[PDB]
Design an enzyme around this catalytic site. Structure first.
Site, PDB file in Angstrom:
ATOM      1  N   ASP A  21      -6.805  -2.098  15.836  1.00 46.38           N
ATOM      2  CA  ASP A  21      -5.960  -1.970  14.649  1.00 46.38           C
ATOM      3  C   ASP A  21      -4.588  -1.450  15.073  1.00 46.38           C
ATOM      4  O   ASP A  21      -4.475  -0.393  15.684  1.00 46.38           O
ATOM      5  CB  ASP A  21      -6.591  -0.995  13.643  1.00 46.38           C
ATOM      6  CG  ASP A  21      -7.778  -1.593  12.906  1.00 46.38           C
ATOM      7  OD1 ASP A  21      -8.538  -0.824  12.282  1.00 46.38           O
ATOM      8  OD2 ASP A  21      -7.946  -2.828  12.941  1.00 46.38           O
ATOM      9  N   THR A  61     -11.409 -11.004  -5.063  1.00 49.57           N
ATOM     10  CA  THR A  61     -11.035 -11.651  -3.813  1.00 49.57           C
ATOM     11  C   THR A  61     -11.884 -12.900  -3.546  1.00 49.57           C
ATOM     12  O   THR A  61     -12.536 -13.415  -4.458  1.00 49.57           O
ATOM     13  CB  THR A  61     -11.172 -10.638  -2.644  1.00 49.57           C
ATOM     14  OG1 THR A  61     -10.856 -11.274  -1.399  1.00 49.57           O
ATOM     15  CG2 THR A  61     -12.590 -10.071  -2.594  1.00 49.57           C
ATOM     16  N   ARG A  90      -1.517 -12.655   4.030  1.00 45.86           N
ATOM     17  CA  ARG A  90      -0.599 -11.521   3.969  1.00 45.86           C
ATOM     18  C   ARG A  90       0.751 -11.974   4.546  1.00 45.86           C
ATOM     19  O   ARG A  90       0.808 -12.961   5.280  1.00 45.86           O
ATOM     20  CB  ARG A  90      -1.176 -10.396   4.829  1.00 45.86           C
ATOM     21  CG  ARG A  90      -0.379  -9.128   4.882  1.00 45.86           C
ATOM     22  CD  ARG A  90      -1.088  -8.093   5.753  1.00 45.86           C
ATOM     23  NE  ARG A  90      -0.801  -6.744   5.285  1.00 45.86           N
ATOM     24  CZ  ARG A  90      -1.558  -6.073   4.423  1.00 45.86           C
ATOM     25  NH1 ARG A  90      -2.663  -6.615   3.941  1.00 45.86           N
ATOM     26  NH2 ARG A  90      -1.186  -4.870   4.014  1.00 45.86           N
ATOM     27  N   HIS A 115      -6.890   5.973   0.708  1.00 45.81           N
ATOM     28  CA  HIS A 115      -7.844   5.706   1.779  1.00 45.81           C
ATOM     29  C   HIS A 115      -7.166   5.492   3.125  1.00 45.81           C
ATOM     30  O   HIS A 115      -5.949   5.338   3.209  1.00 45.81           O
ATOM     31  CB  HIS A 115      -8.665   4.463   1.447  1.00 45.81           C
ATOM     32  CG  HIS A 115      -7.834   3.231   1.259  1.00 45.81           C
ATOM     33  ND1 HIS A 115      -7.006   3.051   0.172  1.00 45.81           N
ATOM     34  CD2 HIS A 115      -7.703   2.119   2.021  1.00 45.81           C
ATOM     35  CE1 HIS A 115      -6.404   1.878   0.269  1.00 45.81           C
ATOM     36  NE2 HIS A 115      -6.810   1.292   1.381  1.00 45.81           N
ATOM     37  N   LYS A 166      -9.401  -2.647  -7.405  1.00 37.46           N
ATOM     38  CA  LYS A 166      -9.797  -3.709  -6.500  1.00 37.46           C
ATOM     39  C   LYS A 166     -11.308  -3.689  -6.308  1.00 37.46           C
ATOM     40  O   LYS A 166     -11.874  -2.693  -5.857  1.00 37.46           O
ATOM     41  CB  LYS A 166      -9.100  -3.533  -5.152  1.00 37.46           C
ATOM     42  CG  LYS A 166      -9.527  -4.522  -4.080  1.00 37.46           C
ATOM     43  CD  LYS A 166      -9.100  -5.939  -4.412  1.00 37.46           C
ATOM     44  CE  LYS A 166      -9.691  -6.928  -3.407  1.00 37.46           C
ATOM     45  NZ  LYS A 166      -9.353  -6.566  -1.999  1.00 37.46           N
ATOM     46  N   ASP A 169       0.869  -1.160   0.000  1.00 36.29           N
ATOM     47  CA  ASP A 169       0.000   0.000   0.000  1.00 36.29           C
ATOM     48  C   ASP A 169       0.911   1.216   0.000  1.00 36.29           C
ATOM     49  O   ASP A 169       1.843   1.290   0.800  1.00 36.29           O
ATOM     50  CB  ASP A 169      -0.868   0.033   1.261  1.00 36.29           C
ATOM     51  CG  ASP A 169      -2.126  -0.789   1.126  1.00 36.29           C
ATOM     52  OD1 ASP A 169      -3.026  -0.380   0.360  1.00 36.29           O
ATOM     53  OD2 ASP A 169      -2.216  -1.844   1.784  1.00 36.29           O
ATOM     54  N   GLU A 208     -11.021  -0.126  -2.376  1.00 34.73           N
ATOM     55  CA  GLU A 208     -11.928  -0.832  -3.274  1.00 34.73           C
ATOM     56  C   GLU A 208     -12.961   0.082  -3.924  1.00 34.73           C
ATOM     57  O   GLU A 208     -13.366   1.090  -3.346  1.00 34.73           O
ATOM     58  CB  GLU A 208     -12.632  -1.951  -2.506  1.00 34.73           C
ATOM     59  CG  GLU A 208     -11.666  -2.793  -1.685  1.00 34.73           C
ATOM     60  CD  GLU A 208     -12.327  -3.973  -1.012  1.00 34.73           C
ATOM     61  OE1 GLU A 208     -13.345  -3.773  -0.313  1.00 34.73           O
ATOM     62  OE2 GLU A 208     -11.824  -5.103  -1.179  1.00 34.73           O
ATOM     63  N   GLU A 245      -7.347 -12.107  -4.810  1.00 32.79           N
ATOM     64  CA  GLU A 245      -6.726 -12.323  -3.511  1.00 32.79           C
ATOM     65  C   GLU A 245      -7.612 -13.208  -2.648  1.00 32.79           C
ATOM     66  O   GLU A 245      -8.773 -13.459  -2.980  1.00 32.79           O
ATOM     67  CB  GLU A 245      -6.540 -10.980  -2.791  1.00 32.79           C
ATOM     68  CG  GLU A 245      -6.191  -9.822  -3.716  1.00 32.79           C
ATOM     69  CD  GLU A 245      -6.010  -8.504  -2.984  1.00 32.79           C
ATOM     70  OE1 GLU A 245      -6.897  -8.120  -2.196  1.00 32.79           O
ATOM     71  OE2 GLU A 245      -4.980  -7.843  -3.209  1.00 32.79           O
ATOM     72  N   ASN A 246      -7.052 -13.686  -1.541  1.00 23.89           N
ATOM     73  CA  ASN A 246      -7.814 -14.479  -0.589  1.00 23.89           C
ATOM     74  C   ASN A 246      -8.407 -13.407   0.310  1.00 23.89           C
ATOM     75  O   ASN A 246      -7.720 -12.452   0.662  1.00 23.89           O
ATOM     76  CB  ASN A 246      -6.900 -15.410   0.216  1.00 23.89           C
ATOM     77  CG  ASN A 246      -5.721 -14.686   0.833  1.00 23.89           C
ATOM     78  OD1 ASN A 246      -4.945 -14.036   0.132  1.00 23.89           O
ATOM     79  ND2 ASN A 246      -5.576 -14.799   2.152  1.00 23.89           N
ATOM     80  N   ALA A 247      -9.680 -13.546   0.657  1.00 23.09           N
ATOM     81  CA  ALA A 247     -10.339 -12.556   1.499  1.00 23.09           C
ATOM     82  C   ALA A 247      -9.843 -12.571   2.941  1.00 23.09           C
ATOM     83  O   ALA A 247      -9.543 -11.529   3.512  1.00 23.09           O
ATOM     84  CB  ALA A 247     -11.845 -12.774   1.472  1.00 23.09           C
ATOM     85  N   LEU A 248      -9.760 -13.757   3.531  1.00 18.38           N
ATOM     86  CA  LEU A 248      -9.331 -13.881   4.918  1.00 18.38           C
ATOM     87  C   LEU A 248      -8.038 -14.676   5.064  1.00 18.38           C
ATOM     88  O   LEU A 248      -7.672 -15.456   4.187  1.00 18.38           O
ATOM     89  CB  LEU A 248     -10.444 -14.548   5.729  1.00 18.38           C
ATOM     90  CG  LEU A 248     -11.799 -13.834   5.716  1.00 18.38           C
ATOM     91  CD1 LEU A 248     -12.852 -14.716   6.350  1.00 18.38           C
ATOM     92  CD2 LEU A 248     -11.694 -12.516   6.469  1.00 18.38           C
TER      93      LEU A 248
END
EC number: 3.2.1.2
Length: 490
Positions: free
Chosen positions: A96, A337, A415, A88, A290, A48, A181, A375-378
């Site tokens: 977080d 995703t 990730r 964003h 995305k 990012d 996104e 991508e894989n979501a989770l």
């Protein structure tokens, strides 16, 4: 050749590799992790490029030093890079670790003009992104939101000219909304949303409100107001007047709003990609966006979660293909995703259909002849998850005589972390990479795995909204294998 069936694999870097203070903190530690990925045969990484970090000092004050060091390290490790123009907010929720708000100078403007943020019916302001409403409003010290995104990408292209020239950067993913996104922030955790809530429409800021008013007026319907019966974030479709059976969403008024609501995103993406094509003209990279994977409620007629996010997808209206067609004029990639998800992994009360969703989107993209990555979501470290991704990477498996019949352009894994590098997890990950590579070893030359790396061409002619919407015509997705032919195990 199995090489023609080779699908490159990328790994998202840890959040905050370059911190909120625009400092490349742990070069030594990242390099260590990167060397392992390299050794594992990973093709490249994704990062990012936080707007909230780069242009923090002030409008048009760009500090690229720290990111350049990042890209330099990545290059020395022999990996390619997918750079996300992240306009964003990062983090923002309790817990977080890495929080990177958008430029404070933009937020200060928001203090005196709350309508620059996506606003829900109740009036809550979401400060993670600037509403589509001000895309063309010169209220940011003279510039419009788009000019901001445009200057940003032009500065990046200029300051990373060496990296773009050496082929370090394979593609530029353009952030287009929350979490980068192309969607509305319809399911914000900070506002109490919890899976599988239908979410809420985010079209109430004054700009979009005036926009809609002018639109309904043209339609000869001044009596039409924005949705007032859609309920709240955590409702179920049937408990609302808008999404319930024979609800407002099927009425002339409902259909008009939804089309208007979803169209904003198509033009939002089309206009901003216009700047990306201009900014990266001639660079040997590909553009990309995305698309969020809203799989809950995909199994019921209202597709509530999808509608509030901005994807007007119904059992008989392809709400994604128009986005793929829009991307075609920019020669861009549609990064999706949920590639790792199986329907059986979601609670029944969510009417979740990630598998079907992925098939619709990928098929639509291939139907428009555009590149489709994902991508894989989770977070997943299990073989089952990898096999699902590999399945989606080549829906009809390997082809013994030529490139695969169907094939994703690439897969970006979420990730990079310590967990991933742990012996057992990494061991499985390595097999995942091998299979994505069709049992072939890392291949440095893209030509061998059918990836033509060429100068980015200017955008093709504008495609009128009605032509883009022609892509909503329902079409059966391509047939998928039930199980891939390249499992990480047997």
């Amino acid at each position: 050749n199995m090489l023609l069936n080779y699908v490159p694999v990328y790994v998202m870097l840890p959040l905050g590799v370059v911190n909120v203070d625009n400092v490349f903190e742990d070069p030594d530690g990242l390099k260590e992790q990167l060397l392992q990925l390299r050794a594992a045969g990973v093709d490249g990484v994704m990062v990012d490029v936080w707007w909230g970090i780069i242009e923090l000092k002030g409008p048009k004050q760009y500090d690229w030093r720290a990111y350049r060091s990042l890209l330099q390290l990545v290059q020395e490790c022999g990996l390619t890079l997918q750079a996300i123009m992240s306009f964003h907010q990062c983090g923002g929720n309790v817990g977080d670790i890495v929080n990177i708000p958008i430029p404070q100078w933009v937020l200060d403007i928001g203090e005196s003009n709350h309508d620059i943020f996506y606003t829900n019916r109740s009036g809550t302001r979401n400060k993670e992104y600037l509403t589509v409403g001000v895309d063309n409003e010169p209220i940011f010290h003279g510039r419009t939101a788009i000019e901001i995104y445009s200057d940003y990408m032009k500065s990046f292209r200029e300051n990373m000219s060496d990296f773009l020239e050496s082929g370090l950067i394979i593609d530029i993913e353009v952030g287009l909304g929350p979490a980068g996104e192309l969607r509305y922030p319809s399911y914000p955790q900070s506002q109490g949303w919890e899976f599988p809530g239908i979410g809420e429409f985010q079209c109430y800021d004054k700009y979009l409100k005036a926009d809609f008013k002018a639109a309904v007026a043209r339609a000869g319907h001044p009596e039409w107001e924005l949705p007032d019966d859609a309920g709240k974030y955590n409702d179920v479709p049937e408990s609302t007047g808008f999404f319930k059976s024979n609800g407002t969403y099927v009425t002339e008024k409902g259909k008009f709003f939804l089309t208007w609501y979803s169209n904003k995103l198509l033009n939002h993406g089309d206009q901003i990609l216009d700047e990306a094509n201009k900014a990266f003209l001639g660079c040997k990279v590909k553009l990309a966006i995305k698309v969020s994977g809203i799989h809950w409620w995909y199994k019921v007629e209202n597709h509530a979660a999808e509608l509030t996010a901005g994807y007007y997808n119904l059992n008989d209206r392809d709400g994604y293909r128009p986005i793929a067609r829009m991307l075609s004029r920019h020669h861009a990639i549609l990064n999706f995703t949920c590639l790792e998800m199986r329907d059986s992994e979601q609670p029944s009360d969510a009417k979740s259909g990630p598998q079907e969703l992925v098939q619709q989107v990928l098929s639509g993209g291939w139907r428009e002849y555009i590149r489709v990555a994902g991508e894989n979501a989770l977070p997943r470290y299990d073989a089952t998850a990898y096999n699902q991704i590999i399945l989606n990477a080549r829906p009809q498996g390997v082809n013994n005589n030529g490139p695969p019949k169907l094939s994703m352009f690439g897969v970006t894994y979420l990730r990079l972390s310590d967990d991933l590098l742990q012996k057992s997890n990494f061991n499985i990950f390595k097999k995942f990479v091998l299979k994505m590579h069709a049992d072939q070893d890392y291949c440095a030359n893209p030509q061998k795995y059918n990836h033509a790396i060429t100068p980015l061409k200017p955008s093709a002619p504008k495609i009128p909204i009605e032509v883009l919407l022609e892509a909503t015509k329902p079409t059966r997705p391509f047939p998928w294998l039930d199980e891939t032919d390249m499992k990480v195990d047997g």
